[PDB]
């Protein structure tokens, strides 16, 4: 049978550029027959420079492969892959408002309500709960990796560091690597071990980013001081005028002992009454798959 993810290049059109990505230019466009009962669909088109190395092309395609496993309202959806001809393309759900970090920055008085903030927290936690439930550790949860849809829905959108943990429940990084130090848990910084627990730590940082309108975590501290500050028990400050529920969630997500941190399901459970009505209809939390 045919590769269900492969799409004929002819069915995809590129309307305009959105911005430069990790492996190449990302465009906004339209694709035909990628969604059921839908003639054409608006999409984001990620490309790989025709001059990219095998190493880069492999990483690019590996991210697409991982995404083929996800089907969640709060996770940016993979819609197809064009692996025949040049350039190599990956088509995904269009998130008109861009990444969450830029969206938060755009709200700065220089350049959101408690309910809006809690709604975002719930959506992100739901996507992460879905990910963890399928035995995947994201490893790079941060506002820059979440996206915002037209209707303001927030979704997990970059999986460059995502790893399958089905067999061992953890992932250990070996050797050297460029890692998101300011979003990493104490145990991860110490011995490169990543678990659903360290994903929860990063979620805490994302909450902080939301409440501060994307301030840089540990601003003023060099990477070195961050490593020491966090591993010794230090924490980011309490954002001014931050909703009590988010301060408490942060406190919980930042327990030094990973086993003391809540799970994404426990996080959602604690704030579910604050979520909008439709959350029960589209969330992984209230789905039958979660039992």
């Amino acid at each position: 049978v045919p590769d269900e993810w492969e799409v004929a290049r002819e069915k995809i059109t590129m309307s305009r550029e959105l911005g430069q990505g990790s492996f190449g230019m990302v465009y906004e466009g339209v694709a035909k027959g990628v969604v059921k009962d839908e003639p054409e669909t608006r999409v984001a088109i990620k490309t790989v420079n025709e001059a990219a190395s095998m190493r880069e092309r492999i990483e690019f395609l590996n991210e697409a492969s991982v995404m083929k496993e996800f089907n969640c309202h709060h996770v940016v959806r993979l819609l197809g892959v064009v692996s025949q001809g040049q350039p190599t393309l990956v088509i995904m759900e269009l998130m008109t408002r861009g990444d969450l970090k830029s969206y938060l920055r755009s709200l700065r008085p220089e350049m959101p309500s408690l309910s809006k903030m809690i709604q975002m927290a719930g959506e992100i936690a739901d996507g992460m709960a879905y990910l963890n439930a399928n035995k995947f550790v994201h490893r790079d949860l941060a506002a820059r990796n979440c996206m915002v849809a037209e209707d303001f829905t927030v979704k997990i959108g970059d999986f460059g560091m995502t790893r399958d943990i089905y067999e061992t429940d953890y992932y250990r990084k070996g050797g050297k690597g460029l890692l998101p130090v300011r979003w990493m848990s104490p145990e991860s910084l110490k011995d490169g071990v990543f678990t659903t627990y360290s994903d929860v730590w990063s979620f805490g940082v994302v909450l902080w980013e939301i409440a501060t309108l994307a301030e840089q975590p540990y601003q003023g501290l060099s990477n070195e001081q961050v490593l020491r500050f966090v591993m010794e028990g230090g924490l980011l400050d309490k954002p001014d005028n931050c909703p009590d529920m988010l301060l408490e969630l942060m406190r919980m997500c930042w327990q030094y002992n990973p086993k003391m941190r809540p799970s994404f399901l426990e996080i959602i459970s604690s704030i579910k009454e604050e979520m909008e009505p439709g959350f029960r209809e589209v969330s992984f939390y209230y789905s039958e798959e979660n039992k």
Binding site: A142, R144, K173, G175, G177, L178, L179, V181
Partner: peptide, 8 residues
């Protein structure tokens, strides 16, 4: 930069 070199 958000990604810093670190070795284990």
């Amino acid at each position: 930069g958000e990604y810093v070199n670190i070795e284990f």
